[PDB]
Amino acid sequence: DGLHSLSYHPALNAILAVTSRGTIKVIDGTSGATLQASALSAKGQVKCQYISAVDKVIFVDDYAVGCRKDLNGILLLDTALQTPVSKQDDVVQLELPVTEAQQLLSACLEKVDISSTEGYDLFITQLKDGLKNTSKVAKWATVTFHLPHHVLKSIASAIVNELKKINQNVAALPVASSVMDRLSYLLPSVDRSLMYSEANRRETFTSWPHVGYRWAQPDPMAQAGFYHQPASSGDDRAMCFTCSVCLVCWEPTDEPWSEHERHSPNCPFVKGEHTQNVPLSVTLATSPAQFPCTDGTDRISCFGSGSCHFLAAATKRGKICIWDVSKLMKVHLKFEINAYDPAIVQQLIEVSLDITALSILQQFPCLLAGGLLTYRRTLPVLLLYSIKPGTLVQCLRLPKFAEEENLCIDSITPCADGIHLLVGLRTCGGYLVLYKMNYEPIKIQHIKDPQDTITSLILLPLGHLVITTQGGYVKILDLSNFEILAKVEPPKEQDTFVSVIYCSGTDRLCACTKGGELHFLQI
């Protein structure tokens, strides 16, 4: 069919290719064998770029920005672009690994009698057929529940309750806890029973007085199973969700697991038993997509990330969202872009503004968007907004030729080395202008050939660059003087290369053609 894009996961050895059909194909980065072919449950072009600074796979559809981390060495893709529902009657989608699917199916068929629960027949039917169909591809296989939120929640709660009643520690208890927590997140609409998930325990620590401790920090404390339930001012009261242990008056040398084990070796969580715990690793690996707009009505045009703890996106209506994507993907700031700004009204020398490229800069942090102003003439410019909010720090008019050459920005990437910013301009056959980061350009280059119009950028570590041109020729290159290292040519009529990526783990570059083939180029 066609791939149309590419990204690479270094923590894994998986190449995440988009497909012209809107699905995502994960193929092996060492042998090129297909590991999985999963549709993200999206609603338009599908984005899949893995971000290295944040260490997460950021998917984007026209409407929502999914952000899935890896778990147990794979990614759960079947619902990366599923957004939270509002009514319990709404059918949620929820994928489980084949192994966890077997855990749940067995514990339902051999361990408990949660049958007669609302919509139990649909649940068992889906699990059975999912496991039958799938009967290294196995490590990535999954089974997806498509069930009314209440059916899935009731069945998960029933399984948890019965597995807690029989008290026989079976693998299905954590799987049902994971299903329950995922549902809790899919319907956003101290309680000791809500601490079975690592995220809840972490959020409990908001008043932890020992932020200076090397090992007793809230993140490790929640990881070890503790949650903070202060009883008085400055009270460092940490209780385990399942153990019933309670600890106080911590010391700098304390380490969560150490104190937990010495103070209660019998805890099922400390022993590594199959408890109800839902680690942050499963929350991050299945968190639901999030709309940038307060309604999600618009289309998404930009999903630029920063070298920094931050992701950003822009919608066609001028609303821009910025997520503290460190772990929790909590929306950090949403603001509005208005072309009639004090900076823009001057730098223009009726009007509308459309953002087309985004980026955030780090070694005070700033959001650097690329915009096209449309009076009626047009002009591509840079826009430096604040984050730490919505105040347009600097509108930067690009050199004069962009006024009449009918160009719009198409990419903005931080320099491979840093302290430098490469901007690219295409027509609404292009320009590459390099700015020195400002803690007019410091360099410029013009491309004239219509078969050398850029169609991608990898910006290998002024570092290096690897693009793909309209002619289908990737031009692995160095930015110091713009020297072509190897303008590889498309294979066979010709099958034009459409994108490239670099495998930090295997050192072999990958190229993907429009036709959908994959070629390994050595460097």
UniProtKB/Swiss-Prot annotation:
Post-translational modification: Ubiquitinated; mediated by RNF41 E3 ligase and leads to proteasomal degradation, impairing inhibition of apoptosis. Deubiquitinated by USP8/UBPY. Autoubiquitinated; mediated by E1 ubiquitin activating enzyme UBA6. Proteolytically cleaved. Acts as substrate for CASP3, CASP6, CASP7, CASP9 and HTRA2.
Effect of residue 243 to S: Impairs ubiquitination of CASP3, CASP7 and HTRA2 mutant 'A-306'. Abolishes interaction with DIABLO/SMAC and impairs ubiquitination of DIABLO/SMAC
Effect of residue 240 to S: Impairs ubiquitination of CASP3, CASP7 and HTRA2 mutant 'A-306'. Abolishes interaction with DIABLO/SMAC and impairs ubiquitination of DIABLO/SMAC
Coiled-coil intervals: none
WD repeat segments: 1-39, 40-67, 291-337, 490-523
Subcellular location: Golgi apparatus, trans-Golgi network membrane; Endosome; Cytoplasm, Cytoskeleton, Spindle pole; Cytoplasm, Cytoskeleton, Microtubule organizing center, Centrosome
Binding site for Zn(2+): 240, 243, 260, 267
Annotated BIR repeat ranges: 190-289
Impact noted for substituting residue 263 to D: Impairs interaction with CASP3 and abolishes the caspase inhibition activity on CASP3. Impairs interaction with CASP7 but has little effect on the caspase inhibition activity on CASP7. Impairs interaction with CASP9
Tissues with expression: Expressed in brain cancer cells.
Top-level taxon: Eukaryota
Entry function: Anti-apoptotic protein known as inhibitor of apoptosis (IAP) which can regulate cell death by controlling caspases and by acting as an E3 ubiquitin-protein ligase. Unlike most IAPs, does not contain a RING domain and it is not a RING-type E3 ligase. Instead acts as a dual E2/E3 enzyme that combines ubiquitin conjugating (E2) and ubiquitin ligase (E3) activities in a single polypeptide. Ubiquitination is mediated by a non-canonical E1 ubiquitin activating enzyme UBA6.
Domain remarks in the Swiss-Prot or TrEMBL record: The BIR domain is essential for its anti-apoptotic function and is important for binding to DIABLO/SMAC and caspases.
Family: Belongs to the BIRC6 family.
Subunit structure: Homodimer; antiparallel. Interacts with RNF41. Interacts with DIABLO/SMAC, likely with higher affinity to SMAC dimer than SMAC monomer; this interaction blocks the substrate-binding site and inhibits the caspase inhibition activity of BIRC6. Interacts with KIF23/MKLP1, USP8/UBPY, BIRC5/survivin, MAP2K1/MEK1, RAB8A/RAB8, RAB11A/RAB11, PLK1, EXOC3/SEC6 and EXOC4/SEC8.
Stated name of the protein: Dual E2 ubiquitin-conjugating enzyme/E3 ubiquitin-protein ligase BIRC6
Originating organism: Homo sapiens (Human)
Residue span relative to the full protein: 68 to 966 of 4857
